[PDB]
Amino acid sequence: MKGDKKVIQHLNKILGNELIAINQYFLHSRMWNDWGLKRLGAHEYHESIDEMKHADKLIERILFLEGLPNLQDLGKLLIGENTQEMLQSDLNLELCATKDLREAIVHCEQVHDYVSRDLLKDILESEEEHIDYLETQLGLIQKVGLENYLQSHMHED
Amino acid sequence: MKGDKKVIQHLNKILGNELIAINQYFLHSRMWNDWGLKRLGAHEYHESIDEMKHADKLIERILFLEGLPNLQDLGKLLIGENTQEMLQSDLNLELCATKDLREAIVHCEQVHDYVSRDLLKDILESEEEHIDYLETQLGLIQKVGLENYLQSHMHED
Amino acid sequence: MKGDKKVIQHLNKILGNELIAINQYFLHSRMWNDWGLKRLGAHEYHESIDEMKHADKLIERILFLEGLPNLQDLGKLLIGENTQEMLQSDLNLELCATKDLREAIVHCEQVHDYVSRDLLKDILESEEEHIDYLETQLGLIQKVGLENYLQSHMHED
Amino acid sequence: MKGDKKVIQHLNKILGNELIAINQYFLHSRMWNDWGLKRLGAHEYHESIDEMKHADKLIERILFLEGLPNLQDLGKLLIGENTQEMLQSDLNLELCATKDLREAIVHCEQVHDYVSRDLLKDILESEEEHIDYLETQLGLIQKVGLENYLQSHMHED
Amino acid sequence: MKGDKKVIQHLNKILGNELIAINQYFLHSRMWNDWGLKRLGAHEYHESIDEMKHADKLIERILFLEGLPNLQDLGKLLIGENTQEMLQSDLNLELCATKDLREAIVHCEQVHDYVSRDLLKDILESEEEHIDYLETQLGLIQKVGLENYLQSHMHED
Amino acid sequence: MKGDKKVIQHLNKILGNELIAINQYFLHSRMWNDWGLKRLGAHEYHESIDEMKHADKLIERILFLEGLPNLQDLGKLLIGENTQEMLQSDLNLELCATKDLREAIVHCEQVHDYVSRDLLKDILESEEEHIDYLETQLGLIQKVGLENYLQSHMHED
Ligand code: HEM
Ligand code: HEM
Ligand code: HEM
Ligand SMILES: [K+]
Ligand SMILES: [K+]
Ligand SMILES: [K+]
Ligand code: NA
Ligand code: NA
Ligand code: NA
Ligand code: NA
Ligand code: NA
Ligand code: NA
Ligand code: NA
Ligand code: NA
Ligand code: NA
């Protein structure tokens, strides 16, 4: 097989994180929709779709490298019970995800798998953009108050 | 006459429920417009129109089955005095309506009037969607506060 | 409250007449459709819709004047059993309606509610147009014969 | 084979009913065209085509369930000698068809073949619409007289 | 009646052959579709439709000639169990059909029914085109092999 | 909570089945793409997307009924090693899925949750269409041979 065994392990680890995020964000989206917070529901749906696209790219890369993609192992979804908790749970997930991404990029560089590194760097940039969004939302709750913040997310853009 | 007599009684009971809802929702709509809560007035107008369309389908079915549509009996309207009472009154009415719809479907199934059952199931789905809307609105009043909730319904979409 | 109490009583009386006409004409429409007299069914549907629009305007005016619109009390629907009887019943209803309208306009003029008077005059003109239609139809039954008259109303325009 | 054997027997019974209706309605259509009653000929042609489409759906379902569609058995056509007999013969056929459809739906429900039930319910709704049309036509012959009724069906819509 | 009695018998015989072909080809079409041989299924559907159009023309001619079209008697459908057998069965049917057509044309010429002859000649040309198609398909099975032939008819044109 | 507790258990069981199918079909799709069987990869991708849409509808219904959607439990994926095993594994999964769907519909009917029944019937129809596709593909491998079947799925439609 052409792929480095540890690269493939790293890519399967990142894929596992994507699978958690897909489901966590999809459920959070539909919870916000059920509550009538449609702007949050829509944004979170798009985050879930973005993670689905990252998972696809990882699966394709693992197969090219002649590894076996692991879609069987689903780690812990941490579903919040209110908007603040859901935003914070998403942020905790992305803090974990970006740490694993950096560790994977280090190893790809070490064994000269520069195309896998580039793939992972693109995912990392996407996850840092999500962190920016999440930190901003939690900050806005403090600046405008929770009731106003939720009011501002009732109606879709 | 081709229709089952108890089917026709059930269809007239549902029709009676639709007639209450048409008038209650239409008056609630115009009360919201009078108060300047135009987004609530618009939504409630459309709920009234939807009930008018259900009444039409029931009337057509009753006549096909050679029954007499009952447009004469108008049950009690429970008109609320403020937004929270109006939403809750609509919700109470829909909970009664869906109970009667389920009882009518049971009977249609028993006598093999499958086309009447299908008509009633479509109405039931519409009324459950209205229950979803109403529970969501009452929840938003709690989450964003009454003053913000009303503010968000001043201007039309 | 800004409205004259007796004006509001008159407007609620007219509204009550509109509510009868809405339902009577809607059922007559669907009866003609069930019988295959689609041109009559279509015309009568449009009369029912026109009365719905008059009811809306009355409700809005009553609320502006700080009265309570009465959508609870539904008077007697007189449903005909054949085309001649249905046309005559509609005409009897409009004869009653136009008398109440004239009495309401007299009172509005007396207390200087000229905007309510104008609203009622517009409804009155609409109801006199319906009387013209109804008298014409009953006259055509005599001039062309009942069978030809019904034949001419089988197919929609 | 995946299909329930009695479900397949019921679907073939309905298919047999569709085959009678296709041929009876097609011949009635062309008889009306021969007589110059082109509006009746056109309507009846479309009824024949609708039955052809139902037969197609039944054939497809039977093959999916691994049964043998029965296009070989053609039951009795009851061809009328004049317009009133042809309409009544079509009505008699539809009353038989809807009885068999209800019996088939009962059995599908009992063995949990819910997709076959749904197919049959859609056919049933179509056949009840045809019953509505036929009863309406026979009623119009009484209301406008036979000669006027036929006159109204000379020219196409 | 204006028509020659034996001409009408011949036209009813041809009509009987069309009714067999309609059903045989329709079922063969849907069998090929069930098997995923969609190009064969589509071609055979169009053959069934073409026979339906021939049946229509025969019915119209028989009625003009003041005969009674026979849509009651359905002869034997010979449904094949695999592609080779279905193609050969269709060919056997067309060999029978074209013989009956030639015999009918002889009789039409004899009694000077030249318009019926022309109608039948047009049907005959259509059936010879179908024979050409069928012989060609059976020849291609021999030239390219059965597996390749079926492969080439999986996907629609 | 408005929902029947066993209805919610059934809806979560179906949701669990959808989650297995999403992942199994997505990986099978990308395995086919890796092997250059792009038409199979495309078809299987669309099957995965369809299951995603069913999962969405189930999640929305569970939340409306005030249950907790279970996106955490992922049952066993049975990933095939070649095309014939992958198709058969998908078929085995769909046979399990339709058994569970029928059991869920039985329960919904018993407790009068007719809107949940209708949702499940629509999913069931989709899964039976997939069974039709899968049985057809396995049949084509037998009819055209494995090498031809795979050749026919190299290039996209
Ligand atoms: C038997 C009771 C009623 C029935 C069956 C009925 C039926 C209908 C139908 C079928 C429409 C057309 C809806 C569409 O296709 O969009 C309509 C429109 C409407 N209805 Fe009713 N209606 C009823 C009573 C009322 C009442 C009591 C009111 C007011 C107090 C009302 C107000 C209206 C208005 C404002 C419209 C829209 C008219 C327009 O097109 O401008 N309806 N109704
Ligand atoms: C097994 C019995 C039959 C089946 C399943 C069948 C099926 C069909 C279908 C699916 C269509 C297309 C309809 C559409 O999508 O609009 C059609 C068209 C048609 N059928 Fe049939 N048919 C059957 C028998 C017959 C018979 C016995 C006749 C005449 C005696 C007939 C006359 C026609 C005609 C004239 C058309 C329209 C053709 C055109 O497009 O010009 N069919 N049929
Ligand atoms: C809870 C599980 C999932 C749900 C509810 C879900 C839901 C959805 C929905 C609703 C769509 C839009 C479909 C449409 O309207 O066409 C979608 C698209 C998509 N999904 Fe999922 N999904 C799930 C898991 C996954 C997984 C695990 C993957 C990949 C391993 C995936 C890959 C994709 C892809 C590639 C798209 C198309 C994205 C695009 O528009 O470019 N999904 N998903
Ligand atoms: K605010
Ligand atoms: K006349
Ligand atoms: K080949
Ligand atoms: Na930020
Ligand atoms: Na005001
Ligand atoms: Na809700
Ligand atoms: Na006049
Ligand atoms: Na003629
Ligand atoms: Na009727
Ligand atoms: Na040839
Ligand atoms: Na490759
Ligand atoms: Na199949």
UniProtKB/Swiss-Prot annotation, chains A, B, C, D, E, F:
- Gene Ontology CC terms: cytosol; ferritin complex
What changes when the gene is disrupted? Answer: No growth phenotype in iron-sufficient conditions, cells do not store detectable iron under any conditions tested, cells secrete less pyoverdin siderophore and deplete iron from the medium slowly. Very low amounts of FtnA-only BFR complexes accumulate in vivo at low O(2) levels.
Q: Which GO terms describe its biological process?
A: intracellular iron ion homeostasis; iron ion transport
> What is catalysed by this protein?
4 Fe(2+) + O2 + 4 H(+) = 4 Fe(3+) + 2 H2O; Fe(2+)(in) = Fe(2+)(out)
Cofactor field: heme b
**Record-listed Fe(2+) Fe2 binding positions:** 51, 94, 127, 130
Covalent S-S links between cysteines: none
- Which positions does UniProt annotate for heme b binding? 52
Q: Which UniProt keywords apply?
A: Cytoplasm, Heme, Ion transport, Iron, Iron storage, Iron transport, Metal-binding, Oxidoreductase, Potassium, Transport
User: Which CDD domains does the UniProt entry name for this protein?
Assistant: Bacterioferritin (cd00907)
Ranges where the Ferritin-like diiron domain occurs: 1-145
Location in the cell? Cytoplasm
Q: Does this entry carry the keyword Oxidoreductase? A: yes
EC number of this enzyme: 1.16.3.1
Q: Where does Fe(2+) Fe1 bind?
A: 18, 51, 54, 127
Q: How is the cofactor bound?
A: Each BfrB homodimer binds 1 heme group coordinated by an axial ligand from each subunit.
Could you say which residues bind K(+) here? 148, 151
| Matching PANTHER family | BACTERIOFERRITIN (PTHR30295:SF0)
Which protein family is it in?
Answer: Belongs to the bacterioferritin family.
Further information: The unstable catalytic diiron-binding site within each subunit (Fe1 and Fe2, ferroxidase center) also serves as a pore for iron uptake; the ferroxidase center is labile. In the iron-loaded BRF crystal structure additional stably-bound iron ions are seen inside close to the ferroxidase pore. Mutagenesis of residues reveals other stably bound Fe cations in the interior of the BFR shell; they may represent a pathway followed by Fe(3+) to the central iron storage core.
The entry's function note states: The major iron-storage protein, part of the heterooligomeric bacterioferritin (BFR) complex. The ferroxidase center binds Fe(2+), oxidizes it using dioxygen to Fe(3+), and participates in the subsequent Fe(3+) oxide mineral core formation within the central cavity of the BFR protein shell. Can store up to 600 iron atoms per bacterioferritin protein molecule.
Assembly and partners? Answer: The bacterioferritin (BFR) complex is formed of 24 subunits (FtnA and BfrB) arranged as 12 homodimers. The holocomplex contains about 8.7% Fe and 8.0% phosphate. A pure BfrB BFR is a hollow shell with an external diameter of 118 Angstroms and an internal diameter of 73 Angstroms that binds 12 heme molecules and up to 600 Fe(3+) ions per subunit. The BfrB-only BFR has twenty-four ferroxidase pores which serve as a conduit for Fe(2+).
Protein name, entry field: Bacterioferritin BfrB
Q: Which organism is it from?
A: Pseudomonas aeruginosa (strain ATCC 15692 / DSM 22644 / CIP 104116 / JCM 14847 / LMG 12228 / 1C / PRS 101 / PAO1)
Provide the gene name from the record. bfrB
